[PDB]
Amino acid sequence: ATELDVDGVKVRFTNPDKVYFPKLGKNGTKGKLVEYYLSVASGPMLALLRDRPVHLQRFPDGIEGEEIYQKRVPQKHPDYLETCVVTFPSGRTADALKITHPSSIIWAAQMGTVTLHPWQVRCPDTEHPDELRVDLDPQPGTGFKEARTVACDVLKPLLDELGLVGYPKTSGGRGVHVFLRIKPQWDFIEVRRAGIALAREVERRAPDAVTTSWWKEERGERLFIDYNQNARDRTFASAYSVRKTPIATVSMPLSWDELRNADPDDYTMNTVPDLLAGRDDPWADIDSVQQSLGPLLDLVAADEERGLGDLPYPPNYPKMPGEPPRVQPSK
């Protein structure tokens, strides 16, 4: 129906009045979603996603229709788009959409993408993450207040003690995501081991409130630090992505002070653009220092001296032919 000029690249856009979020009515159309992404796709969202391969969580007929989690780029796609070869945990490879320009994000939205799921690597170095992900995930009986509390009161002081800087965002669900920008010199195995040592230390400092137990039955009313989010090919909403919630919540980057009193429902595709106006980017300095895993990998070796090694991968998580044997779940 229309051709959009997205930072000098023309992008085809159709069906503006298709309803994606039925509780929002007029405010929950595909047009309002694309309008939201147009509002953020040329700002800090692009910088955070630049050169990353992404997977697309698509809802072509709204969040109550069928869901298509798209990893490989479709065999037929616009000429300008760039792709990057990603390696799945089986060893299989595929051409994934690479975010190189605001038009990349708007094309995704035109295809019904509600949520972008970026890899933790930058192309071309798909071997070494430049990001360690801390996923504070409330289990049944807990919610966002537990997540923000542990994030601000336990995790942030620990990072300060280690000489590390973390950047938090709401997940858009009940949880909190914290990013550590790191030098891309460690592979997925070592970044994940570093995240496990960090998770174990947060758990030691707040054992009544935090768990790393692989078995959900053993977790109780605690936050799970999902250490397996640093494995390959795990869903993880990008900063500024809209989520599959009834009110179209957005994964919102915040400062540590904002997070302390934050409510994730405050940030939606209808509220975020006005909230960003005049406000300093709390993640403005994230790329300013590429940090070493040195402190966390020392914690890993220390844990090995306590008799604490690797933790199990997610259930049925594929493995590569020559990959070292993994730790199996207990019982």
Numbering used by the authors: 6 to 336
From the article:
To define molecular differences between these distinct Prim-Pols, we elucidated the crystal structure of Ms Prim-PolC and compared it to a NHEJ-specific Prim-Pol. Prim-PolC retains the same overall fold of the mycobacterial Prim-PolD (PolDom) structure, which can be superposed with an RMSD of 1.712 Å (over 270 aligned positions, Fig. 5a). Shared structural features include the phosphate recognition pocket containing the conserved basic residues (K23, K35 and N20) that facilitate this key DNA interaction. Despite these similarities, Prim-PolC orthologues possess a strictly conserved C-terminal extension whose function has not been ascribed. In the Prim-PolC structure, we observe that this additional C-terminal region (aa 294–336) consists of a conserved alpha helix (residues G299−R311), which lies across alpha helix 4 after which the peptide chain becomes an unstructured loop. Notably, this structural element, termed Loop 3 (residues G313−P333), is positioned between the two prominent surface loops (1 and 2) that together form a continuous surface on one side of the active site pocket. Apical Loop 1 residues, normally involved in template strand orientation, are not conserved and are instead repurposed for locking Loop 3 into position. Residue P94 packs against a pocket formed of residues Y321, P322, K323 and M324 from Loop 3. Loop 2 residue W219 interacts with Loop 3 residues P316, Y317, P333 and K335 via a mixture of hydrophobic and polar interactions. Again, this has the effect of locking Loop 3 into its current orientation, and also reorients Loop 2 into a more distal position to the active centre, compared to the existing Prim-PolD MMEJ structure.
